Amino acid sequence: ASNFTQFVLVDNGGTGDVTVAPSNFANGVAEWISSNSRSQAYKVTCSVRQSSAQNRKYTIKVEVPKVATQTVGGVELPVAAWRSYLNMELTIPIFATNSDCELIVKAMQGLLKDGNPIPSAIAANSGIY
Amino acid sequence: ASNFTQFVLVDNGGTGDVTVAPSNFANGVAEWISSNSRSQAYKVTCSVRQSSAQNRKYTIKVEVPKVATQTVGGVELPVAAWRSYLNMELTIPIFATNSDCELIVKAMQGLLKDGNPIPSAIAANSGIY
Amino acid sequence: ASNFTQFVLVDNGGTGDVTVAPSNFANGVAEWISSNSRSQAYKVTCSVRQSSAQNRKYTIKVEVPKVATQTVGGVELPVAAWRSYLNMELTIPIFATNSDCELIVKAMQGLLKDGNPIPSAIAANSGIY
Amino acid sequence: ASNFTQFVLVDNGGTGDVTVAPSNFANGVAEWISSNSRSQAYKVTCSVRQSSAQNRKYTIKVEVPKVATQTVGGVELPVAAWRSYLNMELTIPIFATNSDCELIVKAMQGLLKDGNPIPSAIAANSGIY
Amino acid sequence: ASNFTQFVLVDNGGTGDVTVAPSNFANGVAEWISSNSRSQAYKVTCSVRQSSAQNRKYTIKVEVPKVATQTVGGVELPVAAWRSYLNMELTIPIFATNSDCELIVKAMQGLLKDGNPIPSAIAANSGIY
Amino acid sequence: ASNFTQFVLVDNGGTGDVTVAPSNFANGVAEWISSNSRSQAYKVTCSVRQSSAQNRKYTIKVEVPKVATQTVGGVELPVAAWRSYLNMELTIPIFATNSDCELIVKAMQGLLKDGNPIPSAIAANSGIY
RNA sequence: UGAGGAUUACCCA
RNA sequence: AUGAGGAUUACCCAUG
RNA sequence: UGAGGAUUACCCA
RNA sequence: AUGAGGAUUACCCAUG
């Protein structure tokens, strides 16, 4: 393998897709950023570590820019009004096989699948009702 | 509408799919569990809160069990050998438009798409490299 | 989806039926109240909690009022002359599957079925003899 | 005459019905037990008492076992893997006529009727949502 | 019933009406928001509780955006310069019947009716004179 | 002009309408009461204040009485069995245009329009669900 | 009294 | 609030 | 826990 | 100032 490659983070059907490419690997923490200023960039980082004697833990972080009314290349303050932050922690017990691990990935894909409750509440600036 | 509906968490292609259904909304924490004894059920929980004057924060948790039958005191009980835990927090500024929010949802879907770096590392009990 | 909806508490043919509607769901306690004066209303509350490591516990309460008019100093108010109070607690181990739970529900319905010892003693101001 | 008789606690069509038979009526507590091993039996108890000057109070208890075989040292015994415990207390003022009592009984039957919020939450390992 | 539905908050005679739709139901507090960023959204929340032994209390809150010179989807600070807040508390004694309650609703509709003093002072950036 | 005029608080369609008239302006609190003994009168009060350097705040109160005749000391007095209280505060930024203010007034009128969720819940002694 | 626990007519505050 | 802090996972830790 | 009470999500042992 | 704090409703509470 060698999975440290460029990938499409936001699929817009070929036109205006957001691709994210390897940009840093300091300390085993892989980073991928889009082609923008770091203030307006799409950013992804990932790392695995053994949290305790029984678990391994993946920490994945995603930063997404506020695009509506954005001035490309501009200085937009406050930083917090223009960015969203995703932080995921996946704890997997050392007994989990590749097959167990494949199922965990499907559970994550199913959760965020289009039309499902969670992605629909988020996309609509809503909660559950 | 009511976005509090059941969905399939693990799509095993129509056969052996894991579907999760609404099971509790006490304390503003939406919960969904699979049709199992509570000791073996998959579980999804979600809540949103205005974490600050200018952010809203979603807290999402998924528990994937490894089911087993355990003999306790000579008697057999439906149990989970172990559980894998996904904990995610998403902070979105209040200035984010619905289309800004849809962008976050798509980035999360792309991040986990089959074949992309992260879901590949996880499924192979590997790190990024 | 929701099970926090209105339902018929007292079925009197299709007329004189007492319906109880959702009213409040604060702190994990769901409350249903019948219409008109809160003073002469029926009330149902329900809550679930993990009572211990292996148990989940339901607490249900029902109040049946004796509707009456109070006259004091010539001022009459709608009141409940008195009220019966039902309180029930149901403990279910986390090992109970959906089938086990359905059986528990049938046992509760059979206990109170018309003609059986218990609903008969109560409906007649009686005990067991 | 007697209301201390056997009755169907769990109606499973006309086969697999759990019947509970009188067993003991000591100290004002009537007890009903299903047949076969006392260890795997269903149990119902009921008692009435004048709780105060104006009230009479019923205390009803039901136990639904999870039938299982225990094997220890090669010696197997019929046991209940676990048990659900229902406990209910019903307070009725001495002013309640037979009509008032019949209404109280219908309110209890309606609460647990199939399809209503409460029996539905329990039968599905759920709470209110 | 089931009154948790979408409704027209600002009636502009069909063209450019502001509709507000269910968006959250965490803790029994119903929320409805318009289709906008949460910073520019029309928001309505409502909840009932028994404040004391004699009263029930409805708490209704409304947030209305400053629309003149607004930049749709933009980041507009300070938040307080761009939003109006309405907070209503309605205390109703437990003796009030549906009919008493209908009259209270008319009293509220009459107060805010067009051409009446209060709505005319507000709409004119005025007080009473 | 002088917006301090009488209006009909409860429009019972020309017959039995409750009209309220200016009755006091002491201390900057505009008051309106119905033609009744002060013990049975409906009452509306309103005041505006620059609550901060950048806001103005309107405080509005409505009292709806439930009238009755009470025999105190063998003598009959016109009285109110109870009163329902509406307390509302509206904070508007100083930057709000007159058309911004008209938008607030319309949102308040739509909120309470017949058939909409909130006025429906109140009139039926119900919550939102 | 307790949306207090339970090995369920026990036990706790 | 922050942590590539921990968990038995709607809990705990530390810092601030 | 309680065949403990209650103005019933309170209170008592 | 904030409170889905209370009221007997132009008063009271709590926090800050």
Side-chain angles (χ1 to χ4, degrees):
Chain A
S2 171
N3 35 216
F4 199 18
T5 59
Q6 183 190 53
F7 68 102
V8 176
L9 188 67
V10 180
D11 188 339
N12 275 323
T15 257
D17 290 352
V18 172
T19 276
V20 111
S23 54
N24 202 349
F25 202 52
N27 276 280
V29 177
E31 172 186 271
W32 287 261
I33 57 155
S34 59
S35 205
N36 288 271
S37 64
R38 303 207 62 128
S39 61
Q40 298 184 328
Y42 275 83
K43 183 169 118 202
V44 184
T45 57
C46 177
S47 63
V48 216
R49 70 184 165 290
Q50 177 136 354
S51 50
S52 78
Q54 229 89 112
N55 297 302
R56 268 205 317 139
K57 238 224 245 289
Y58 285 86
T59 296
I60 301 145
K61 304 201 191 199
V62 183
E63 291 183 18
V64 183
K66 167 181 163 55
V67 172
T69 80
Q70 159 195 80
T71 300
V72 188
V75 177
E76 306 170 316
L77 278 337
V79 165
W82 289 97
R83 301 188 73 64
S84 298
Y85 304 88
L86 168 64
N87 196 289
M88 305 183 2
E89 279 217 325
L90 184 58
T91 292
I92 307 174
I94 60 173
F95 308 105
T97 64
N98 282 4
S99 287
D100 292 327
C101 288
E102 279 171 24
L103 187 124
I104 290 162
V105 175
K106 292 175 157 313
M108 291 184 280
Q109 297 171 331
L111 179 83
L112 300 164
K113 198 205 181 193
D114 233 30
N116 283 353
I118 314 285
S120 313
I122 293 163
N125 258 311
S126 295
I128 303 295
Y129 59 87
Chain B
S2 172
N3 52 4
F4 206 175
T5 61
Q6 66 163 86
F7 59 105
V8 350
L9 181 69
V10 181
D11 175 6
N12 273 325
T15 55
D17 293 3
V18 176
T19 117
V20 120
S23 54
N24 200 348
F25 206 169
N27 293 302
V29 174
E31 186 197 67
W32 284 259
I33 89 298
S34 61
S35 279
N36 284 94
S37 65
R38 220 75 195 183
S39 64
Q40 302 190 320
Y42 278 74
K43 182 168 166 194
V44 180
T45 61
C46 172
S47 71
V48 203
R49 107 184 102 112
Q50 191 123 348
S51 74
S52 144
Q54 298 173 9
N55 297 137
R56 281 177 56 256
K57 177 169 173 168
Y58 291 86
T59 292
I60 298 142
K61 303 180 189 191
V62 181
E63 294 183 11
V64 169
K66 176 66 177 179
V67 302
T69 297
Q70 178 177 72
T71 303
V72 185
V75 190
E76 295 188 339
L77 303 171
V79 102
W82 45 260
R83 271 174 189 264
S84 173
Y85 306 88
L86 166 63
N87 281 285
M88 71 175 55
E89 309 205 308
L90 170 66
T91 303
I92 303 171
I94 59 167
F95 312 96
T97 268
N98 278 359
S99 60
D100 280 329
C101 285
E102 294 168 15
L103 216 46
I104 296 165
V105 176
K106 288 161 162 295
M108 292 188 301
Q109 288 166 346
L111 180 80
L112 299 163
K113 195 186 182 190
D114 270 334
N116 283 349
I118 286 133
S120 293
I122 298 171
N125 274 283
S126 178
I128 270 62
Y129 69 94
Chain C
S2 264
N3 65 358
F4 189 37
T5 49
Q6 111 187 102
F7 64 101
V8 179
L9 186 58
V10 181
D11 185 311
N12 276 315
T15 43
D17 296 356
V18 172
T19 288
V20 114
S23 102
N24 181 241
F25 193 178
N27 296 102
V29 180
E31 182 183 289
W32 283 266
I33 296 284
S34 62
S35 212
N36 258 303
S37 309
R38 172 57 261 259
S39 61
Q40 305 184 321
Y42 283 71
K43 166 177 171 184
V44 181
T45 62
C46 176
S47 76
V48 216
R49 65 173 168 293
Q50 182 85 29
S51 64
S52 88
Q54 325 233 285
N55 295 320
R56 273 209 317 144
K57 190 150 162 178
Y58 290 79
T59 297
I60 322 291
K61 300 191 176 194
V62 177
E63 299 181 9
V64 181
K66 179 53 188 185
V67 163
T69 288
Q70 168 177 75
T71 302
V72 172
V75 185
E76 56 198 44
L77 304 175
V79 296
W82 45 263
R83 279 176 182 263
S84 301
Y85 298 87
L86 170 70
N87 285 288
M88 36 182 280
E89 299 217 309
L90 181 57
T91 297
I92 305 178
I94 63 175
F95 306 109
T97 62
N98 280 17
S99 299
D100 298 328
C101 291
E102 294 176 6
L103 196 75
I104 291 155
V105 176
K106 294 174 161 308
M108 299 185 270
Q109 296 171 336
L111 175 80
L112 300 161
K113 190 197 186 188
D114 261 350
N116 284 353
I118 293 169
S120 296
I122 303 169
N125 266 305
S126 291
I128 304 301
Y129 57 90
Chain D
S2 264
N3 65 358
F4 189 37
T5 49
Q6 111 187 102
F7 64 101
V8 179
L9 186 58
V10 181
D11 185 311
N12 276 315
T15 43
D17 296 356
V18 172
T19 288
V20 114
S23 102
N24 181 241
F25 193 178
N27 296 102
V29 180
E31 183 182 289
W32 283 266
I33 296 284
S34 62
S35 212
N36 258 303
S37 309
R38 172 57 261 259
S39 61
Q40 305 184 321
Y42 283 71
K43 166 177 171 184
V44 181
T45 62
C46 176
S47 75
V48 216
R49 65 173 168 293
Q50 182 85 29
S51 64
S52 88
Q54 325 233 285
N55 295 320
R56 273 209 317 144
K57 190 150 162 178
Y58 290 79
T59 297
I60 322 291
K61 300 191 176 194
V62 177
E63 299 181 9
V64 181
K66 179 53 188 185
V67 163
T69 288
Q70 168 177 75
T71 302
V72 172
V75 185
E76 56 198 44
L77 304 175
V79 296
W82 45 263
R83 279 176 182 263
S84 301
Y85 298 87
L86 170 70
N87 285 288
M88 36 182 280
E89 299 217 309
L90 181 57
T91 297
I92 305 178
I94 63 175
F95 306 109
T97 62
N98 280 17
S99 299
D100 298 328
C101 291
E102 294 176 6
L103 196 75
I104 291 155
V105 176
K106 294 174 161 308
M108 299 185 270
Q109 296 171 336
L111 175 80
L112 300 161
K113 190 197 186 188
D114 261 350
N116 284 353
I118 293 169
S120 296
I122 303 169
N125 266 305
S126 291
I128 304 301
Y129 57 90
Chain E
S2 171
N3 35 216
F4 199 18
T5 59
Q6 183 190 53
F7 68 102
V8 176
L9 188 67
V10 180
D11 188 339
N12 275 323
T15 257
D17 290 352
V18 172
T19 276
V20 111
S23 54
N24 202 349
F25 202 52
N27 276 280
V29 177
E31 172 186 271
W32 287 261
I33 57 155
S34 59
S35 205
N36 288 271
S37 64
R38 303 207 62 128
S39 61
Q40 298 184 328
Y42 275 83
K43 183 169 118 202
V44 184
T45 57
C46 177
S47 63
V48 216
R49 70 184 165 290
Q50 177 136 354
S51 50
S52 78
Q54 229 89 112
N55 297 302
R56 268 205 317 139
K57 238 224 245 289
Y58 285 86
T59 296
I60 301 145
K61 304 201 191 199
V62 183
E63 291 183 18
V64 183
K66 167 181 163 55
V67 172
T69 80
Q70 159 195 80
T71 300
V72 188
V75 177
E76 306 170 316
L77 278 337
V79 165
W82 289 97
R83 301 188 73 64
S84 298
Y85 304 88
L86 168 64
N87 196 289
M88 305 183 2
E89 278 217 325
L90 184 58
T91 292
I92 307 174
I94 60 173
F95 308 105
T97 64
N98 282 4
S99 287
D100 292 327
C101 288
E102 279 171 24
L103 187 124
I104 290 162
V105 175
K106 292 175 157 313
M108 291 184 280
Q109 297 171 331
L111 179 83
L112 300 164
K113 198 205 181 193
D114 233 30
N116 283 353
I118 314 285
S120 313
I122 293 163
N125 258 311
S126 295
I128 303 295
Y129 59 87
Chain F
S2 172
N3 52 4
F4 206 175
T5 61
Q6 66 163 86
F7 59 105
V8 350
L9 181 69
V10 181
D11 175 6
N12 273 325
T15 55
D17 293 3
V18 176
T19 117
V20 120
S23 54
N24 200 348
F25 206 169
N27 293 302
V29 174
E31 186 197 67
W32 284 259
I33 89 298
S34 61
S35 279
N36 284 94
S37 65
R38 220 75 195 183
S39 64
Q40 302 190 320
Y42 278 74
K43 182 168 166 194
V44 180
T45 61
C46 172
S47 71
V48 203
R49 107 184 102 112
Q50 191 123 348
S51 74
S52 144
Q54 298 173 9
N55 297 137
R56 281 177 56 256
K57 177 169 173 168
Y58 291 86
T59 292
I60 298 142
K61 303 180 189 191
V62 181
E63 294 183 11
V64 169
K66 176 66 177 179
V67 302
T69 297
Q70 178 177 72
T71 303
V72 185
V75 190
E76 295 188 339
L77 303 171
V79 102
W82 45 260
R83 271 174 189 264
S84 173
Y85 306 88
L86 166 63
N87 281 285
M88 71 175 55
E89 309 205 308
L90 170 66
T91 303
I92 303 171
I94 59 167
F95 312 96
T97 268
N98 278 359
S99 60
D100 280 329
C101 285
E102 294 168 15
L103 216 46
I104 296 165
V105 176
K106 288 161 162 295
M108 292 188 301
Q109 288 166 346
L111 180 80
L112 299 163
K113 195 186 182 190
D114 270 334
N116 283 349
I118 286 133
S120 293
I122 298 171
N125 274 283
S126 178
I128 270 62
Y129 69 94

